[PDB]
């Protein structure tokens, strides 16, 4: 999946194997294949409660940057999932 601040699906783009010179020629073999987004979990606190993020490796920082913006935010209310959501 893709899920979080990430915003990245999983693109199906082929991988074609070839045999060759480049200084004599270059020929082929080709098939569809699915490229996945490097993707990790990120646990963080945010007031009370924990809260995980199924984010891509790229935007791991964005998530911390989000908790920083959350300090300026008024939250609580037994909001486990609810925080994440209201957490933009």
């Amino acid at each position: 999946s893709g899920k979080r601040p990430i915003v990245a699906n999983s693109i199906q783009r082929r991988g074609k194997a070839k045999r060759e010179g480049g200084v004599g020629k270059k020929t082929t073999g080709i098939s569809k294949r699915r490229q996945y987004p490097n993707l990790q979990k990120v646990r963080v606190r945010v007031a009370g409660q924990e809260i995980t993020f199924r984010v891509a490796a790229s935007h791991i920082p964005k998530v911390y940057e989000l908790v920083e913006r959350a300090k300026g935010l008024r939250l609580e209310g037994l909001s486990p999932k609810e925080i994440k959501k209201e957490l933009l």
Binding site: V44, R45, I60, P61, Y64, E65, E68
Partner: protein
């Protein structure tokens, strides 16, 4: 990573600093324990504030130091309070040293920022050392009688 730490560590350094560490050390330790903080744009500036605020602050106090430093130098506090022929009937403290000053002129001064251990019980004239700033000492002339 760039991070601004809020705690001295033999590791990285004294508080308020800003040092590069590997993101891990930040993400999974320093940052959440709170020993350090993501040095975002906001924080770097929130640190300007934290500086400028006390920075100009102290200088503006030292201001009111060269203010007293000039008055307190060209002046002697004549302190009339009964006394034997050498010793004093009772005693003069900084508190008194202070009120006499705040009356005999109107200049207010913190009694504590005034070097004097045991109260004066001798009769005579002295010069006690006042200190609102650790780089602005003031020799205060006086005269119990």
């Amino acid at each position: 990573m760039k991070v601004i730490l809020l705690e001295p560590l033999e590791n990285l350094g004294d508080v308020g600093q800003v040092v590069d560490v590997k993101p891990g050390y930040a993400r999974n330790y320093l940052l959440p324990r709170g020993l350090a903080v993501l040095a975002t744009e906001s924080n770097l500036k929130a640190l300007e504030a934290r500086i400028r605020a006390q920075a100009k602050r102290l200088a503006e106090r030292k201001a009111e130091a060269e203010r007293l430093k000039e008055i307190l130098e060209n002046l002697t506090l004549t302190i009339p309070v009964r006394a034997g022929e050498t010793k004093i009937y009772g005693s003069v403290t900084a508190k008194d040293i202070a009120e006499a000053l705040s009356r005999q002129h109107g200049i207010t001064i913190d009694p504590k920022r005034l070097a004097l251990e045991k109260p004066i019980k001798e009769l005579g004239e002295y010069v006690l050392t006042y200190k609102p700033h650790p780089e602005v000492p003031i020799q205060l002339k006086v005269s119990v009688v």
